[PDB]
Design a protein around this ligand. Structure first.
Ligand SMILES: [Mg+2]
Lengths: 66, 84, 199, 244, 266, 271, 91
């Protein structure tokens, strides 16, 4: 279900961004290709920032605990 | 631009050229000769180099191309001939 | 239908790329997608491509242009280097906003290299990491440039170069040094200009 | 897609949970909610990679030596350890401790009997594991048992990732010495990955994470939960885990 | 279980072999704890757990890469009808036609095996030996993967006449009856020949044509469909697709063999 | 005692963030247990404040439990002090978030709520824009940092060293200390002391250059941090009410529950 | 010291791999070592001896299309312009 970018059994990649763009246009939540592409891009940025923070914090915790 | 050869009987280099490496003894000899040419024979400056030569040639004075094979093996695959 | 599935197939997911695989010009960012295969599929030469990759290849990463060609070869290269550079950047910790709120082709901010945010510092058992130190190699006798963790940077000195530099000359790259990354910025063309200091 | 393993007697465990340790609501938190959470996070982290094809134990063994994917390791570790924990508290596959395990505890712990060893493990868990953690009884290559504790998500198998020392606070100089010899052991290996051999295996596993006990036992009284876990273990699994 | 193994004394530490057995016991019990892997492709299963012909979908064929045809520059125009289109410089094979042809060929293999005929699996590319051997073993058939000797069928006396032959019952049970020299020297001809790489096995196809041996093959975009009795449009250069199709055919043959044995045991 | 705060009451809620049971277990039971342990380990902690205890009792393995429980209590108090509650619906009434929460995407890059400047906290928001780009970035970074904490820990806003030169965001784990001068140089100290022992009974020099560098600073070798805000990543606060999958809901409600006037009170002037 | 041709210089800001610090990289770089290609009319450059001289040898021989790399159209116009320049007294 492409109401959200992350799918179980799938990685988080650019193809997810294009798939969300097509889902947005199909449901006509947004009209133009550029708008849906930008919205999916910003969701992608948020998710990737969250993953980067998890990785950094996990490494820091590992060094914190010996 | 790209040039496409016709269907050829073979794909072979007439004279494959191999990179034989010049013997270490020969180049050391040349360096010693240039040393004695500039500083002089039995000069104090480059006498150390002589020692190296005395070792390098002590045991012995002086101490392969597969292009045709691979070309013949691969020609049928890469020639790009039309089907039949 | 078959067309829809082919449109959503992973081979279709790889964007059309036709740049020269062997490139001798300046390299600022990745130009080919890295294709990864699991060890089990590597054992059987299955990479998800049209044809089986030769068994000579032992690496699990490659970058490719054509699924098939007139010469009946897959146009590929057994290289997966660039990811490591990206990952190595994550080890440096230096942060680099367009990621916050007709088609334009400019590189948007950092084009996937780093999605970190500037305002954070690293805690360590010794204590707060004030300044990040990474090892690198000074390349030439010139400012001076250093290969540090997959990227070339210009090193900002502190008084005079160590005499080791003058003694070694052009063999300088043989010896490792420890640098502190002063700053990281991204130029418009995609180059990552980092300034570091030789400790 | 990593999926929550099916458990025997799942309907009964939903109805009541593990007897004399957890209620039904607590067992939902520890397993049905936390294991699903961990598995979903691992699937999101490892999907589209090689690691989707490997089990959590093989994932953590693979990923132990690489700093930047510790998160994956953590998830994998938990996904393994939690299941181990659950299996030693399942009602059944009363089970009795085996003669071999009793002999090993008697020989391993300087002649001490099993119950005072249980109390010692309670003391260790109360003392060193501040907050979230795991407790294990593990056997090394010398056929010797001993008690190990890991902070947050740590693994008994690989000693570099044991996470048995909390550096957020101070450390005893002996702990620093242990860390330094451990790092020397790691560095001695000629392998590029830096891997080292460790044949340690967990015979007993106890979940000290707040998901296990907080709802049933409160912020305090964790040692009460540990005692209840140790008293009413499923000894068939524990006996099987030991090799003879 | 593990004979000729000398355990160690309790005082001394584990031995290397004791450690190996200890870790094996751990692996078979506890190493697989934490999650169950689902919806993940494991190559070996394609050989050992092939699907039945009726359970095959277009999605399953596309996942195996069967649709990926040769480069458009190497097109054999006689294969026009099997092509769905071209995409990224290669021709795409129409997987519905592939499904129909594959079901037909699987029925052919099942019928031939159910009749007790000889089925020969010929494939001479690099890593095809495993699937060929497994298909032959589960269909009680025969296989060749090293090299097809020209004249194996048209010159059988000079090639295959020296190797030993065997009389068997309806249940494929050895009878151990002594064969006469004339019986041993007869040609034994395959009833069905399946070729994984028909482009590199023109000799086998021509021999089957001359000897009236019906043949199946995987017909890629650059292969001639009319050289075989039962073509299967699909990718022949990917080991996954070849193994998928071969496993389907082998399972059909195994089903035919099982039906034959069941009828003979009633 | 100083542990308990006036804006929390037994049997009364914190609107939006905790229920009655949630606040009870998170705060009152936790402080009861923590003060019991702290007073048991040392009776003298009653007289001295928590910060003085942390400073005096640090760097000693024997006196560890004192610093551990002092830091736990102090950080819990610091985290809860900035709270004010939020208008959003009570956590008790809302159905608990389930597995779908994992699949939902954050909006922390396209939204901003509870901005400090609207209440009138102009200087704090100005400084956050100055050092963290924008409040969108600050909120994203803080919540991502605290989300990533696997177990017990806190995410802190801090200021350098009373005047600050620059602001930063920190993480502390299982009763860590936000300020740095208590623990700085401990590993180098033990390394030198261990080498002295080992010789009494060079990798050390190369590693010592890096050790000094990691904590070496400009205009001084010792660096200190003023705490300004703290969030709690521990399951104790949020597991009871929101559940396993509800940490993000907890953190967003916490963010809406921040009063920035208390944070400004902690703000140390300016360079 | 190391002769410059024997040393590989990584430019500033460029990524690299360990292979770059190798003689193989130098050999590969060696192996793979204007206006008239910009849509302009070479015939218009017939009273401009310098730009025409860019496309001739030291002796004044017009360079082959293999050397210039121009299109056949622009190659013909360049040859015509060079010959015209020769005829009119320029070049
Ligand atoms: Mg083919």
């Amino acid at each position: 279900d492409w109401s959200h970018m992350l799918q179980i059994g799938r990685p988080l990649d650019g193809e997810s961004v294009i798939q969300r763009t097509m889902y947005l246009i199909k449901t006509k939540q947004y009209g133009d290709m550029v708008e849906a592409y930008d919205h999916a891009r910003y969701e992608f940025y948020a998710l990737r920032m969250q993953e980067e923070t998890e990785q950094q914090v996990a490494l820091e915790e590992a060094e914190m605990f010996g | 631009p790209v040039y496409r050869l016709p269907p050829l009987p073979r794909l072979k280099v007439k004279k494959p050229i191999i990179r034989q490496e010049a013997n270490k003894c020969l180049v050391l000899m040349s360096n010693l000769l240039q040393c004695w040419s500039s500083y002089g024979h039995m000069s104090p400056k480059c006498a150390g180099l002589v020692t190296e030569l005395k070792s390098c040639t002590s045991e012995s004075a002086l101490g392969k191309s597969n292009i045709n094979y691979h070309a013949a093996r691969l020609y049928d695959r890469i020639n790009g001939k039309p089907h039949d | 239908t078959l067309a829809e599935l082919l449109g959503r197939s992973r081979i279709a997911q790889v964007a059309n790329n036709h740049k020269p695989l062997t490139y001798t010009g300046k390299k600022f960012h990745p130009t080919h997608q890295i294709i990864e295969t699991k060890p089990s599929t590597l054992y059987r030469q299955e990479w998800g491509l049209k044809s089986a990759i030769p068994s000579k290849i032992k690496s699990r990463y490659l970058v490719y242009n054509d699924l098939d060609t007139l010469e009946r070869i897959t146009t590929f290269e057994p290289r997966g280097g660039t990811q490591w550079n990206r990952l190595r950047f994550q080890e440096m910790g230096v942060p680099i906003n367009p990621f916050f709120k007709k088609f334009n082709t400019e590189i948007i901010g950092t084009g996937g290299l780093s999605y970190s945010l500037p305002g954070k510092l690293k805690n360590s058992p010794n204590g707060v990491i004030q300044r990040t130190v990474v090892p690198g190699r000074i390349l030439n006798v010139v400012k001076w440039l250093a290969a540090i963790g997959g990227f070339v940077a210009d090193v900002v000195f502190f008084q005079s170069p160590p005499s080791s530099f003058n003694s070694m000359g052009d063999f300088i790259r043989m010896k490792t040094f420890l640098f502190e990354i002063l700053e990281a910025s991204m130029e418009k063309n995609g180059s990552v200009s980092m300034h570091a200091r030789l400790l | 897609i990593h999926v929550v393993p099916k458990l025997p007697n799942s309907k009964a465990l939903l109805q009541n949970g593990v007897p004399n340790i957890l209620s039904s609501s607590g067992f939902k938190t520890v397993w049905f909610d936390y294991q699903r959470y961990l598995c979903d996070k691992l699937t999101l982290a490892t999907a589209g990679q090689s690691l989707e094809s490997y089990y959590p134990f093989h994932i953590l063994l693979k990923t132990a030596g690489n700093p930047l994917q510790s998160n994956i390791f953590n998830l994998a570790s938990s996904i393994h350890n939690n299941h181990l924990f659950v299996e030693n508290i399942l009602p059944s596959a009363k089970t009795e401790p085996s003669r071999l395990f009793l002999s090993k505890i008697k020989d391993s712990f300087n002649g001490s009997d099993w119950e005072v060893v249980k109390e010692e493990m309670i003391y260790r868990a109360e003392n060193e594991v501040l907050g979230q953690g795991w407790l294990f009884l593990v056997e090394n290559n010398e056929k010797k048992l001993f008690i190990l504790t890991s902070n947050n998500n740590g693994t008994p198998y690989y000693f570099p990732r044991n996470q048995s020392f909390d550096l957020n606070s101070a450390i005893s100089i002996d702990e620093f010495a242990t860390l330094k010899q451990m790092k020397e052991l790691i560095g001695k290996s000629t392998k590029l990955n830096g891997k080292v051999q460790d044949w340690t295996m967990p015979i007993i596993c106890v979940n000290l994470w707040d998901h296990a006990y907080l709802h049933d036992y409160g912020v305090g009284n964790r040692s009460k939960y540990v005692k209840n876990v140790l008293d009413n273990l499923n000894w068939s699994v524990v006996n099987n885990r030991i090799f003879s | 279980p593990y004979p000729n193994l000398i355990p160690s004394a309790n005082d001394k530490p584990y031995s290397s072999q004791e450690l190996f057995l200890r870790q094996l016991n751990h692996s078979m019990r506890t190493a697989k704890l934490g999650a169950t892997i689902s919806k993940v492709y494991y190559p070996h299963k394609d050989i050992f757990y092939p699907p039945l012909p009726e359970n095959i979908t277009v999605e399953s064929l596309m996942s195996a890469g069967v649709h990926l045809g040769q480069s458009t520059s190497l097109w054999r125009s006689s294969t026009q009808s099997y092509i769905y289109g071209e995409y990224k410089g290669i021709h795409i094979i129409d997987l519905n036609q592939t499904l129909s042809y594959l079901k037909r060929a699987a029925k052919v293999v099942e019928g031939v095996s159910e009749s007790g005929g000889i089925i020969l699996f010929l494939g001479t590319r690099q890593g095809q030996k495993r699937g060929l051997e497994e298909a032959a073993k589960k269909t009680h058939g025969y296989y060749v993967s090293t090299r097809w000797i020209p004249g194996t069928l048209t010159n059988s006396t000079e090639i295959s006449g020296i190797w030993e032959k065997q009389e068997i019952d309806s249940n494929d049970n050895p009878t151990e009856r002594a064969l006469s020299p004339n019986e041993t020297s007869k040609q034994v001809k395959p009833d069905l020949l399946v070729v994984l790489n028909p482009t590199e096995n023109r000799n086998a196809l021509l021999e089957a044509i001359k000897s009236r041996v019906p043949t199946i093959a995987i017909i890629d975009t650059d292969s001639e469909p009319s050289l075989v009795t039962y073509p299967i449009p699909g990718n022949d250069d990917s080991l996954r697709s070849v193994n998928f199709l071969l496993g389907v055919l082998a399972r059909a043959g195994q089903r035919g063999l099982q039906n034959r044995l069941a009828r003979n045991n009633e | 005692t100083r542990y308990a705060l006036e804006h929390l009451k037994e049997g009364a809620p914190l609107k939006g963030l905790f229920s009655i049971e949630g606040l009870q277990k998170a705060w009152f039971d936790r402080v009861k247990y923590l003060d019991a342990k702290l007073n048991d380990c040392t009776n003298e902690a009653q007289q001295k404040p928590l910060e003085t205890l942390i400073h005096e009792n640090s760097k000693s393995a024997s006196k560890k439990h004192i610093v551990n429980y002092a830091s736990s209590l102090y950080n819990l108090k610091f985290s809860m002090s900035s709270l004010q509650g939020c208008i959003r619906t009570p956590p008790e009434e809302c159905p608990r978030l389930g597995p779908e929460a994992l699949l939902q995407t954050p909006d922390f890059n396209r939204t901003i709520s509870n901005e400090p400047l609207t209440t009138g906290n102009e200087r704090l928001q100005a400084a956050l824009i100055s050092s963290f780009g924008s409040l969108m970035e600050f909120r994203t970074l803080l919540i991502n940092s605290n989300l990533a904490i696997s177990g017990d820990g806190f995410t802190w806003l801090v200021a350098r060293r009373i005047e600050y030169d620059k602001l930063f965001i920190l993480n502390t784990y299982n009763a860590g200390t936000p300020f740095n001068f208590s623990t700085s140089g401990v590993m180098n100290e033990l390394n030198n002391q261990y080498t002295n022992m080992e010789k009494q009974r060079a990798k050390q020099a190369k590693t010592k250059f890096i050790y000094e560098t990691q904590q070496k600073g400009f205009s001084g070798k010792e660096v200190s941090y003023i705490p300004l805000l703290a969030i709690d990543a521990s399951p104790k606060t949020w597991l009871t009410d929101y559940g396993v999958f509800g940490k993000r809901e907890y953190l967003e409600r916490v963010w809406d529950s921040i009063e920035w006037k208390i944070v400004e009170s902690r703000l140390p002037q300016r360079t | 010291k190391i002769d410059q041709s024997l040393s590989k210089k990584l430019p500033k800001g460029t990524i690299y791999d360990p292979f770059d610090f190798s003689m193989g990289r130098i050999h590969l770089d060696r192996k793979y070592q204007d206006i008239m290609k910009s849509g302009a009319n070479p015939l218009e450059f017939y009273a401009r001896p310098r730009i025409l001289s860019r496309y001739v040898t030291s002796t004044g021989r017009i360079q082959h299309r293999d050397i210039t790399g121009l299109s056949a159209k622009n190659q013909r116009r360049l040859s015509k312009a060079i010959r015209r320049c020769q005829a009119i007294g320029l070049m």
